[PDB]
Amino acid sequence: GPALKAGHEYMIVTNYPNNLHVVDVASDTVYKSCVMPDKFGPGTAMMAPDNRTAYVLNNHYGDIYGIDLDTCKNTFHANLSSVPGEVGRSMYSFAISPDGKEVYATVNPTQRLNDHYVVKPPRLEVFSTADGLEAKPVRTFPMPRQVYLMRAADDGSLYVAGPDIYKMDVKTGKYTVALPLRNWNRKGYSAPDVLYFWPHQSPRHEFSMLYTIARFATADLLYGYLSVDLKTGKTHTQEFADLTELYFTGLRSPKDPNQIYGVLNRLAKYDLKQRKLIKAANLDHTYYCVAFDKKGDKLYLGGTFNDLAVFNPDTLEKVKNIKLPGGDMSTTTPQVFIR
Amino acid sequence: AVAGCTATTDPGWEVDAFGGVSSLCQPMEADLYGCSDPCWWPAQVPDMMSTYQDWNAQASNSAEDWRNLGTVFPKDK
Amino acid sequence: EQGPSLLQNKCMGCHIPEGNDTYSRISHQRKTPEGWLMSIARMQVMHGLQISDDDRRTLVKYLADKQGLAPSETDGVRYAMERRLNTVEQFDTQLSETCGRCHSGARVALQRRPAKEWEHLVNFHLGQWPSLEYQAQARDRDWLPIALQQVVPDLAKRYPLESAAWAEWQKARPKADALPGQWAFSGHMLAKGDVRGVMSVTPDQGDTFKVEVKGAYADGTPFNGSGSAILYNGYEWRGNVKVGDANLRQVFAALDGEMKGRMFEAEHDERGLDFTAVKEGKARLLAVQPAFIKAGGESEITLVGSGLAGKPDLGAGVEVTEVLEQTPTLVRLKARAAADAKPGQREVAVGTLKGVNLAVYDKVEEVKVVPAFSIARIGENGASVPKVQGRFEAEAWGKDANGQPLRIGYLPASWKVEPFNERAVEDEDVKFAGKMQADGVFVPGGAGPNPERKMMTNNAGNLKVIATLADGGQTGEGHMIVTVQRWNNPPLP
Ligand code: HEC
Numbered sequence: 002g003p004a005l006k007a008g009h010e011y012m013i014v015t016n017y018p019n020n021l022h023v024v025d026v027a028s029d030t031v032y033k034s035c036v037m038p039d040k041f042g043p044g045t046a047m048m049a050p051d052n053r054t055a056y057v058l059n060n061h062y063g064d065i066y067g068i069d070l071d072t073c074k075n076t077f078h079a080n081l082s083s084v085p086g087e088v089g090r091s092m093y094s095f096a097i098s099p100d101g102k103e104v105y106a107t108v109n110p111t112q113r114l115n116d117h118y119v120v121k122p123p124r125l126e127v128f129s130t131a132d133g134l135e136a137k138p139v140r141t142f143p144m145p146r147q148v149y150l151m152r153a154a155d156d157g158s159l160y161v162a163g164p165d166i167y168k169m170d171v172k173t174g175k176y177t178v179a180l181p182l183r184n185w186n187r188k189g190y191s192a193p194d195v196l197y198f199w200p201h202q203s204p205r206h207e208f209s210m211l212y213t214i215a216r217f218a219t220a221d222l223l224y225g226y227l228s229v230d231l232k233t234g235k236t237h238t239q240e241f242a243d244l245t246e247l248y249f250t251g252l253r254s255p256k257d258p259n260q261i262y263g264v265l266n267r268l269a270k271y272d273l274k275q276r277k278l279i280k281a282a283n284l285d286h287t288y289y290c291v292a293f294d295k296k297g298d299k300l301y302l303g304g305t306f307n308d309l310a311v312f313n314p315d316t317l318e319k320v321k322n323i324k325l326p327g328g329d330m331s332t333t334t335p336q337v338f339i340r
Numbered sequence: 341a342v343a344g345c346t347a348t349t350d351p352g353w354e355v356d357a358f359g360g361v362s363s364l365c366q367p368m369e370a371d372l373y374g375c376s377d378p379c380w381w382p383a384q385v386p387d388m389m390s391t392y393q394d395w396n397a398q399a400s401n402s403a404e405d406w407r408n409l410g411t412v413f414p415k416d417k
Numbered sequence: 418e419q420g421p422s423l424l425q426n427k428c429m430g431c432h433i434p435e436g437n438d439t440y441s442r443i444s445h446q447r448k449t450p451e452g453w454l455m456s457i458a459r460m461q462v463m464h465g466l467q468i469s470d471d472d473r474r475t476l477v478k479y480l481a482d483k484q485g486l487a488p489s490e491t492d493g494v495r496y497a498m499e500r501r502l503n504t505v506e507q508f509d510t511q512l513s514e515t516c517g518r519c520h521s522g523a524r525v526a527l528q529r530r531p532a533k534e535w536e537h538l539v540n541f542h543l544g545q546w547p548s549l550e551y552q553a554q555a556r557d558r559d560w561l562p563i564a565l566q567q568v569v570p571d572l573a574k575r576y577p578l579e580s581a582a583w584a585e586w587q588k589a590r591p592k593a594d595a596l597p598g599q600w601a602f603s604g605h606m607l608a609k610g611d612v613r614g615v616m617s618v619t620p621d622q623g624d625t626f627k628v629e630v631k632g633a634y635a636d637g638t639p640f641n642g643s644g645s646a647i648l649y650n651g652y653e654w655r656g657n658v659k660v661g662d663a664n665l666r667q668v669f670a671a672l673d674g675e676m677k678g679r680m681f682e683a684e685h686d687e688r689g690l691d692f693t694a695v696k697e698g699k700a701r702l703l704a705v706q707p708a709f710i711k712a713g714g715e716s717e718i719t720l721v722g723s724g725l726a727g728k729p730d731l732g733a734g735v736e737v738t739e740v741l742e743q744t745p746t747l748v749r750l751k752a753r754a755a756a757d758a759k760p761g762q763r764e765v766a767v768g769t770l771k772g773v774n775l776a777v778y779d780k781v782e783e784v785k786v787v788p789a790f791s792i793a794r795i796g797e798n799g800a801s802v803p804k805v806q807g808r809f810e811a812e813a814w815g816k817d818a819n820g821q822p823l824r825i826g827y828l829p830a831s832w833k834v835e836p837f838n839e840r841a842v843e844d845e846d847v848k849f850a851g852k853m854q855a856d857g858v859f860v861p862g863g864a865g866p867n868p869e870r871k872m873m874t875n876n877a878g879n880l881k882v883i884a885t886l887a888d889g890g891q892t893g894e895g896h897m898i899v900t901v902q903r904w905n906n907p908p909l910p
C-alpha cells in the first residue's frame with residue numbers, strides 16, 4: 002500500500018490472525034497493514050539494516066520470512082526443516098547480519114520416525130537473503146542446547162543467548178563465553194535466571210535482557226539488567242531492585258539511561274544508580290513488552306491483547322491506546338525504526 | 341501444588357511462584373496465547389506450536405472471543 | 418472386531434509387526450485402562466489415527482487386560498484414576514521437577530516400561546514440545562543429558578516392564594463371574610454426608626455388567642440408580658450409574674469380594690464420594706453412621722455391612738435404646754450416651770462382628786478443615802469448561818480418657834470466606850471469587866475477564882475458608898485458591 006516516508010519514525014508489531022502492522026509514531030495511528038503468509042507464531046520481527054525489510058519468525062517457529070514494508074511483498078523465506086526426516090524449530094533464535102546479507106537461526110531439530118522421535122543436536126543455519134523464497138542453508142555449524150535470542154554486533158560477530166551468552170564467529174562457527182550466566186560462579190549469589198523472548202531493537206543499540214538472582218528461604222530476590230553493546234561488544238550487568246513483583250521486559254530510557262522501565266502487571270520506573278523504585282503505574286491489563294521511541298518521549302506497551310498503550314515516561318501515565326486491527330499480539334515484539 | 345495444577349511458574353498457570361494468583365495474567369486471557377503459542381503449559385493449556393495449531397481459530401481476540409476456545413481431549417461421542 | 422485384528426488394521430504401517438500379534442512400542446509397555454485410552458487418543462490428535470469410539474473401546478479393553486498393572490503396582494497412586502485432583506503429591510524431587518511439573522507424577526507411576534521405552538518417551542517430550550527445556554526447572558540445567566542419563570535408569574528401575582507382581586497377577590487373576598451378587602456399600606460425599614445401601618451386580622456380555630444402586634444419604638436424600646460397568650484386568654472396575662439426574666462414574670478396585678474406590682459425577686470430578694463395598698457371602702461390618710456420639714446424647718445410629726446378625730453393642734457408656742430396623746446389611750438404632758460416658762473410641766459390634774469404632778466425646782478442642790488446601794476454578798459463563806467447586810468438611814478433635822487425641826469426625830458447621838492476604842483484601846476477592854454456601858460448598862464465579870474488577874481480571878481469589886462448629890463454636894481454617902480453567906483434561910491428571 003502506501004510506502005513508508007523517509008525521516009519518519011515507525012513501529013512494527015505483529016497481530017494474531019497473521020498481520021504485520023506499521024504504526025506511524027508521530028500520530029500514533031496505524032499507517033498500513035500487511036497480511037503475512039502461512040500461519041502466525043510467534044510473529045517475532047526485527048528490521049533489516051535497510052529500514053525497509055522486516056524479518057519474521059513465523060509459521061509455528063519453523064520458518065523465517067522477509068517482508069518489504071513499502072509494498073507488503075514477501076521477499077524472502079527460509080524453511081528451518083531442510084534436513085531430510087527432521088522438523089526444525091527456532092526458540093526465538095534468529096538474527097540479521099550488519100549488512101543485511103545473511104540471516105542466522107539456531108534450529109533445534111527432531112527426527113520424526115514412524116513409531117518414535119529422536120531429538121537431535123541443535124545447529125546454526127545461515128541463509129543468504131539474496132536467495133529469495135526458496136532459501137536453503139549456505140552454511141551450518143553445531144550449537145549448544147537451550148539457545149534462544151541472538152543479535153549480530155556491528156563487527157559481524159553474533160552474540161548468542163544460551164546457558165551463557167556466547168560470542169560467535171559466523172564464518173568459522175567457533176564461539177567463546179562472552180558473559181557467563183549459568184557458569185557465573187559469583188560468590189554470595191545463586192546462578193541467574195533468564196526468561197527473555199523479546200529481541201529489542203532499542204535506540205541504545207544494545208542486546209539487553211532482565212534476569213533475577215538470589216543473594217544469600219533466606220535468599221534475597223533481586224532484579225538485574227544485562228547488556229551487550231552492539232557497537233563495542235562491551236558487556237554489563239547490575240541488580241537494580243529487590244524483587245517485589247515480576248516484569249517480563251525492561252528497557253533503559255534513551256533519554257535518561259539511569260532509568261529502567263519494567264512491565265507485566267504494573268509499569269515500574271526504576272533508578273539504576275539508587276537501585277530504587279521511583280514510580281509505578283497500574284495497567285488496564287497485563288502487558289508483556291515495552292518499546293521506546295527514538296527520543297524516549299513515549300513508551301509503548303505491547304504484547305497480550307490487540308492494543309498498544311502509549312505512556313508518557315516522565316509522568317508515567319497512559320496518554321492513549323492504539324487499537325490494532327485483528328486479535329492478540331501475544332509474544333510479539335514492538336520494533337521502532339526511522340525509515 | 342495440587343495433582344491437577346502446573347508447577348512451572350513462569351509466572352505459572354493455576355498458581356504463581358509466590359503461591360497466589362496475583363503474579364498471573366490479569367486477566368488470564370492476556371497471557372493465554374503467550375502460554376499457548378510456545379506450549380508453556382501443555383498439560384493444561386493446549387499447544388499451538390505443535391499439537392493443536394488451530395486452537396484459537398475462532399478466537400483470535402481472546403479478550404472478546406474466549407468463549408470459542410474448546411476443550412481438546414477426544415472424549416467418547 | 419477382535420483386539421488383534423484391530424491392532425494390525427489400525428496401528429500397523431506406523432508400528433512394526435514383531436510377530437504373533439506384537440508390535441513396536443505397543444507390546445513393550447503396561448498401563449492402566451485410562452493410560453491406554455490416552456495413548457490411543459494421542460495417536461488421533463497428534464498422528465491422525467482414524468478410529469471410531471467403539472473400536473477404540475475394543476482396543477483399550479484388549480490392551481488393558483493383556484498389558485495392565487498388578488494391583489500392588491497401583492498402590493498409592495490410585496487417586497489419579499479416581500480423579501482426586503486436589504491431592505498433594507509426594508514423590509522424590511528429581512521425579513517431581515523433571516516429570517511432575519506439568520502433569521502429575523502419578524501419570525508416570527501408573528506405567529511400567531523397560532529403559533528403552535522410557536528413553537523414547539523422553540525424546541518424544543522434547544520433540545513434541547521444544548520449549549520444554551527452556552521452562553522453569555529445565556532452563557537451569559542440562560535437561561536432556563540429565564533426563565537420559567539419570568532419570569531414564571531410575572524410571573526403569575522403579576517402574577520396570579517385568580515384575581514378580583505382574584507375573585503372579587497374570588496367573589492369579591480372577592474372572593468377571595466372581596463379581597455378580599449383592600454388594601452392601603458405605604460411602605461419604607464431602608459437604609453432603611454419609612451414604613449407604615446395596616449395589617446389585619448382574620452379568621452381561623463378557624466382562625460387562627448391569628448395575629443397580631439402592632440406597633440413601635444420611636440426611637434422607639435417595640441414592641437410587643441404574644447403569645453398567647466393565648471390568649479390566651480382573652480388578653479394575655469402571656462403571657457409569659445414572660443416579661437421579663446425574664451420571665456418576667465409578668472407579669473401583671474389586672479385590673477379594675471387596676470394592677474400594679470413588680464415585681464421582683462424570684462432568685465434575687470434585688463432586689464425588691469415597692466408596693467401599695463388600696460382597697454378600699462374607700460377614701463384614703462396613704461402617705457406623707455417624708461415627709460419633711456426644712456424651713449425654715440421644716442419636717440415631719445406623720450400622721452398614723454384610724451378614725449382620727446378633728445384638729448390637731456400642732461399647733461402655735453407650736445405650737441402644739431401640740433397634741428401629743435390623744436387616745442383614747443395615748441396622749438403624751437409637752442410642753444414648755451417658756453424660757458420664759468416658760470419651761474415647763468404642764469397638765462396635767453386631768453379635769460377634771467387630772470392626773468399626775464409635776467415638777464418644779465430651780467437648781471439641783481442635784477443628785481442622787478438610788481439605789486443608791484445594792483449588793476451585795472459574796468456569797461456565799459461556800465457556801467450554803464447568804466450574805470446579807470447593808467442597809469442605811470440619812473435622813473435630815478432642816481428647817479421650819487417657820489424655821490422648823481423639824478424632825471425633827465431621828461435625829456440622831457454619832462456613833464463611835475471608836481474604837487470605839492483604840492482596841486479596843485490596844482486590845476484593847471475597848466479593849468476586851464466588852459464593853460460599855452454608856453447606857460448605859463454594860461456588861466459584863463465572864469465567865472470562867470481569868470489567869467490574871481491577872484490570873478487568875477474572876473472578877479468581879486467594880481465600881481463607883473458615884468453619885465454626887455448631888457444637889461449641891470452635892473454629893478451623895483452610896486455604897482455597899480459586900483459579901483459571903484448563904482446556905486439556907485427559908482421563909489422568
Ligand atoms: C519426566 C521426564 C516425564 C515423564 C516420565 C513423563 N512426562 Fe509427560 N506429558 C506432557 C503432556 C502434554 C502429555 C500428554 C498430552 C496431554 O496430557 O494432553 C504428557 C504425557 C505423558 C505420558 C503419557 C504417554 C502416553 O500416553 O503414551 C507419560 C507416560 C509421560 N508424559 C511421562 C507434558 C510433560 C511436561 C511439560 C512440558 C513434562 C516436563 C513432562 N511431561 C515430563 C514427563
Ligand code: HEC
Nearest residue numbers: 114115116117118427428431442443456460464466538541
Ligand atoms: C501413524 C500415523 C500412527 C498410527 C496409525 C499409530 N501410531 Fe502409535 N505412535 C506413532 C508415533 C510417531 C509414535 C511415537 C511418538 C509418540 O507419540 O509417542 C507412536 C507411539 C505410540 C506408543 C508409545 C507412546 C509412549 O508414550 O511411549 C503407543 C503405546 C502407541 N503409539 C500405540 C498405538 C496404537 C495402540 C495404535 C493403534 C490404534 C497406534 N499407536 C497407531 C504413530 C502412529
Ligand SMILES: *NNc1ccc([N+](=O)[O-])cc1
Nearest residue numbers: 198332350351374375380
Ligand atoms: N507463562 N507464560 C509466558 C508467556 C510469554 C512468555 N514469554 O513471551 O517469554 C513467557 C511466559
Ligand code: NI
Nearest residue numbers: 783784892893
Ligand atoms: Ni486449631
